[PDB]
């Protein structure tokens, strides 16, 4: 099996191709920036009602309705304007680890240790919410899921694989293989034709939803990648790992650009999310706090304190008006 | 907007009934299609034990979901691939995991050249051997218990307690001791 010699000689050619394509780091050409200073964001709303730790949340396209997944076995839909609960969906499996809100606002998905992405109909003619389809076929825990339309959805699983599902038939039309570690998070591009994936191997891969091939592979992290999120332009993405740092990768450059870290921060990142402009990089940490990173200068522009337990998820609205921050204290906080 | 508060009142009324059954239920993780659930109830106290099914051997991610359970039932097989020492390192990683320092572990147990400290090891007289048991069997059995207890008493930081045992009543009495210590620490008594 000494073709490993070819594999090590080929990855050196890729590494030397990245060194030649790098004139100056993004942080180097940044002195033309008016510093944003201290970003003091305050808790404008606190949605209570969840019984156990909150693992994931997802905003709707209307930026008013949001779904939250807590490990107590309940999927609550919140109206962030009036704190009113629109729906309270009981789940068959209480160990939910992710939740998704469809762009049309008619369906919501969730998954976890049951390896099943349950689809729920929110616009039944009877008026109640029940299960639409149970997407089974994954051999590992569901870590993330994102809707492409009312009938298509990609899921990430702990079996080092990602799959594209057909909600009408309940079949996997495309399975994405190539990862070696437990996949933790996914994120679609604004054109929803590509999506990056973060696994437990300090590597991120670029996928094509149609052809089902791994376009690019990005390394540079030292521990398991915990969260991932695309840039608003779809040409870059950020990663959160257990090595207590965030790194921003680049698609057409195929090289790590920025490293968001500090000596006083020795805890990993649990969630990442860009704002509407992409100027700020919000990241949830394991020290029960959230740190707003300047995506261009790599300097922390603000801290989001107030959560009494580990922050799990982070979501920025489509219009960039609010930020919902879920944590293990069974509380959701809205910031501005 | 007025009809919206009517639905919010209907939902919060259901959430209050769902809190009564969740806070009065002991959740347990069994270690040793994705997850098998088992609802058993002892002395009219509801227990919800979860057995991990179709999941890979990499546990450093999905084990954090069980950080708020009452106790993790860690079953060890007292054994050649040296399976017992592999469980010692797994119990070591679970005991010193950042999110399981407050999660107690109910240790359920069930050699000669794989542990050199077994030669000069003496049976503690505080042990209670069962009647009709060979003394060297007692020494080898309690030696494995001391290997797990040595890891459990090497880190005083954390609310986790290790309960070694050599079946449902043992879990019931242990969970009662865990919630009792949880109540004493809320009042800064223990």
């Amino acid at each position, epitope marked *: 099996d000494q073709l490993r010699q070819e594999a090590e000689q080929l990855k050196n050619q890729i590494r030397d191709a990245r060194k030649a394509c790098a004139d100056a780091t993004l942080s180097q050409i940044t002195n033309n920036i008016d510093p944003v200073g201290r970003i003091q964001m305050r808790t404008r709303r606190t949605l209570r009602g969840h019984l156990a730790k909150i693992y994931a949340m997802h905003w709707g396209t209307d930026s008013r309705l949001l779904v939250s997944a807590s490990q107590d076995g309940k999927l609550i839909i919140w109206d962030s304007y009036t704190t009113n609960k629109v729906h309270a969906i009981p789940l068959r499996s209480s160990w939910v680890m992710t939740c998704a809100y469809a762009p049309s606002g008619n369906y919501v998905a969730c998954g976890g240790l049951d390896n099943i992405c349950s689809i729920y109909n929110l616009k039944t003619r009877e008026g109640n919410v029940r299960v639409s389809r149970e997407l089974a076929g994954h051999t590992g825990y569901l870590s993330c899921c994102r809707f492409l339309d009312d009938n298509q959805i990609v899921t990430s699983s702990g079996d080092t694989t990602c799959a594209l599902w057909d909600i009408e038939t309940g079949q996997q039309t495309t399975t994405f293989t190539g990862h070696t570690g437990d996949v933790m998070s996914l994120s679609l591009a604004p054109d929803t034709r590509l999506f990056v994936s973060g696994a437990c191997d*300090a590597s991120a891969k670029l996928w094509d939803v149609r052809e089902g091939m791994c376009r690019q592979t990005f390394t540079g992290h030292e521990s398991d990648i915990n969260a991932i999120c695309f840039f608003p332009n779809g040409n870059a993405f950020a990663t959160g790992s257990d090595d207590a740092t965030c790194r921003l990768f680049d698609l057409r450059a195929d090289q790590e650009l920025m490293t968001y870290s500090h000596d006083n921060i020795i805890c990993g990142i649990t969630s990442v999310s860009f704002s509407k402009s992409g100027r700020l990089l919000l990241a949830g940490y394991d020290d029960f706090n959230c740190n707003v990173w300047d995506a261009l200068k790599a300097d922390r522009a603000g801290v989001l304190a107030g959560h009494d337990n580990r922050v799990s998820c982070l979501g920025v609205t489509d219009d960039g008006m609010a930020v919902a921050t879920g944590s293990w204290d069974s509380f959701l906080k809205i910031w501005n | 907007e007025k009809a919206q508060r009517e639905a919010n009142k209907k939902i919060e009324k259901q959430l209050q009934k769902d809190k009564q059954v969740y806070r009065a239920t002991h959740r347990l993780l069994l270690l040793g299609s994705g997850i098998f659930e088992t609802k058993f109830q002892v002395d009219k106290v509801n227990f919800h034990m979860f057995d991990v099914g179709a999941q890979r051997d990499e546990r450093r991610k999905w084990i954090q979901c069980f950080n708020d359970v009452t106790a993790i039932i860690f079953v060890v097989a007292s054994s050649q691939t040296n399976r017992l020492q592999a469980a010692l390192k797994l119990f070591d990683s679970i005991w010193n995991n950042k999110w399981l320092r407050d999660t107690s572990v109910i240790l359920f147990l069930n050699i000669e*050249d794989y542990f050199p400290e077994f030669a000069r090891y003496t049976t503690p007289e505080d042990a209670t051997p069962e009647p009709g048991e060979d003394p060297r069997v007692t020494r080898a059995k309690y030696f494995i218990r001391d290997e797990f207890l040595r890891i459990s008493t090497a880190s005083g930081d954390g609310r986790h307690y290790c309960y070694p045992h050599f079946n449902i009543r043992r879990v019931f009495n242990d969970c009662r001791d865990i919630i009792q210590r949880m109540h004493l620490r809320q009042y800064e008594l223990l």
Partner: nanobody
Amino acid sequence: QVQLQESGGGLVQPGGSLRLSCAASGFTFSNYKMNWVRQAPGKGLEWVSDISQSGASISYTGSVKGRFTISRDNAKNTLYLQMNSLKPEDTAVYYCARCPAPFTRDCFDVTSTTYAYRGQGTQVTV
């Protein structure tokens, strides 16, 4: 990129000596805990020895306690395993392992299959 390329190995008569070396790169060697994992032919992976980030806390398996010793040069980003008085039971592929959590007392998912952050392995035949 976590490479963790190992050195050493070879055929040594029973009762000889050998010294294994890990060539770590892509991460900070001083912040992560190191481990030694070997795979006997026809058997599963097993933990050999680990050493703390500082170098004080040291543990071995019972089959190697007293004969093998663990060492790490934090200034050189390398890990040493001086093997003394080897046995024919030590014939296995020795992998240099590293659990991903830094600054942590727990060292998870070592000695596991399909597990990254571990080297290709060196063959020590006795």
